[PDB]
């Protein structure tokens, strides 16, 4: 779309994109996450979580420390630019955030924090 992207996480631990370009015209950006498949949220939950590339691992590690009731995310983690909820199959969640939180030239990663899953469920996001 524009100033937005629909992303899907499937039953095989994959997002259907690995690269998002955010048009610098946009004042806000919206991610619409959905989960086609049958698998439930405790086995195959997906979230879409954005951080700088440098911050991704600490976010993933502390998200694992926080656990499933915290949607596998440290509450108020200052390094998380934007995140959806964790969703199961057939569910949908959107997050919108201010584009002024990003800058050109910097490297951002989006990823799911379900334990173990970010090895596959990840990609890059750039402002251009």
Swiss-Prot record:
- InterPro entries documented for this protein: Azurin, BlueCu_1, BlueCu_1_BS, Cu-binding_ET, Cupredoxin
Q: Which cysteines are joined by disulfide bonds?
A: 3-26
GO CC annotations? Answer: periplasmic space; plasma membrane
Provide the residue positions that the database annotates as binding Cu cation.
46, 112, 117, 121
Q: Which Gene3D superfamilies match?
A: Cupredoxins - blue copper proteins
MF GO annotations: copper ion binding; electron transfer activity; identical protein binding; transition metal ion binding; zinc ion binding
Every Plastocyanin-like domain range: 1-128
Q: List UniProt keywords, sorted A-Z.
A: Copper, Disulfide bond, Electron transport, Metal-binding, Periplasm, Signal, Transport
Q: Which domain of life is it from?
A: Bacteria
Under Pfam families, the record lists: Copper-bind
PROSITE patterns associated with the record: COPPER_BLUE (PS00196)
Localization terms from the record: Periplasm
Function (record text) = Transfers electrons from cytochrome c551 to cytochrome oxidase.
**NCBIfam families recorded for this chain?**
azurin
User: What is the name of this protein?
Assistant: Azurin
Q: Which organism is it from?
A: Pseudomonas aeruginosa (strain ATCC 15692 / DSM 22644 / CIP 104116 / JCM 14847 / LMG 12228 / 1C / PRS 101 / PAO1)
């Amino acid at each position: 779309a524009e100033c937005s992207v629909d992303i899907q996480g499937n039953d095989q631990m994959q997002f259907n994109t690995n690269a998002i370009t955010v048009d610098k015209s946009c004042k806000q950006f919206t991610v619409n996450l959905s989960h086609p498949g049958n698998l439930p949220k405790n086995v195959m939950g997906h979230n879409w979580v954005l951080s700088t590339a440098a911050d991704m691992q600490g976010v993933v590690t502390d998200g694992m420390a926080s656990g499933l009731d915290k949607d596998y995310l440290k509450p108020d983690d200052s390094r998380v630019i934007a995140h959806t909820k964790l969703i199961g199959s057939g569910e949908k969640d959107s997050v919108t955030f201010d584009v002024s939180k990003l800058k050109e030239g910097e490297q951002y990663m989006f990823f799911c924090t379900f334990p173990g899953h970010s090895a596959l469920e990840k990609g890059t996001l750039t402002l251009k």
